[PDB]
Design a protein around this ligand. Structure first.
Ligand SMILES: Nc1ccn([C@H]2C[C@H](OP(=O)(O)OC[C@H]3O[C@@H](n4cnc5c(N)ncnc54)C[C@@H]3O)[C@@H](CO)O2)c(=O)n1
Ligand SMILES: Nc1ccn([C@H]2C[C@H](OP(=O)(O)OC[C@H]3O[C@@H](n4cnc5c(N)ncnc54)C[C@@H]3O)[C@@H](CO)O2)c(=O)n1
Lengths: 124, 124
């Protein structure tokens, strides 16, 4: 059972000067989106585009994935994305990320039917 | 088994949410801290002071809890906290919170040996 003391810490404690700071975006999203359980996912990109625009990439430019698979596609246009990358100081269970906002082309692997994005490969 | 398409949306999609937004704090924090599972937690306060300063409230001003219990204590000084409350448009599982930065005295219930904070009662 989660002790009452530990529950209180989880539900009400967030010690710090700038808790609502945008440089915290990745720390909170990586946690919310469940990518900090068991280990700290080292790198992860968030796309701030319409889901309609991201799905459209699956019928755009064909390219080879980094792992040799052949079901990857590159966006014809650049997309507003946020790069979340683990800091040198990050150490599980205290995962820390650097938030970087950029506009780059994305590369995703598409699968299933209808064909939709199932993996983020890279940004170029 | 979560679908590949759904897994991609959870891990890489953040349409209509600006990374450079202070108002989003509550939404991400409530999600990250596991308070939006099963249903949306109506109200929840986050304290930004040090854990030591919060624990010390248990040795301060003795007051009655809202529920009639007698193990509540009020802080001698105002503390930096964030008040999170559901919006009108909040609907599970799309929980939405309004973020309000405030400086008020907190009231907590203390228990255990040593006596540590185990429930947040109110800010005044
Ligand atoms: N700039 C970057 C660089 C990396 N990343 C992330 C996304 C990847 O996560 P995810 O998309 O869940 O991938 C899940 C898993 O899917 C598998 N996979 C690889 N190629 C695939 C393909 N063509 N189709 C389906 N699954 C594939 C292996 C992979 O670990 C992870 C590992 O490469 O790094 C990122 O977000 N931004
Ligand atoms: N401004 C406000 C107003 C409300 N709230 C939150 C905190 C409460 O969650 P929690 O901290 O778990 O504490 C409530 C739970 O703790 C337990 N509890 C309640 N009274 C207690 C007491 N006197 N001693 C020990 N545990 C108590 C059971 C109870 O459901 C929640 C429901 O009252 O509302 C807030 O964060 N800020």
């Amino acid at each position: 059972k989660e002790s009452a003391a530990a529950k209180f810490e989880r539900q009400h404690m967030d010690s710090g000067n700038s808790p609502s700071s945008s440089s915290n975006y990745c720390n909170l999203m990586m946690c919310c989106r469940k990518m900090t359980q068991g280990k700290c996912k080292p790198v992860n990109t968030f796309v701030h585009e319409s889901l309609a625009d991201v799905k459209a990439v699956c019928s755009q430019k064909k390219v080879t994935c980094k792992n040799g698979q052949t079901n990857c596609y590159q966006s014809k246009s650049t997309m507003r994305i946020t790069d979340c990358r683990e800091t040198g100081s990050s150490k599980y269970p205290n995962c820390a990320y650097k938030t970087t906002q950029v506009e780059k082309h994305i590369i995703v692997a598409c699968g299933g039917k209808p064909s939709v994005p199932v993996h983020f490969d890279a940004s170029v």
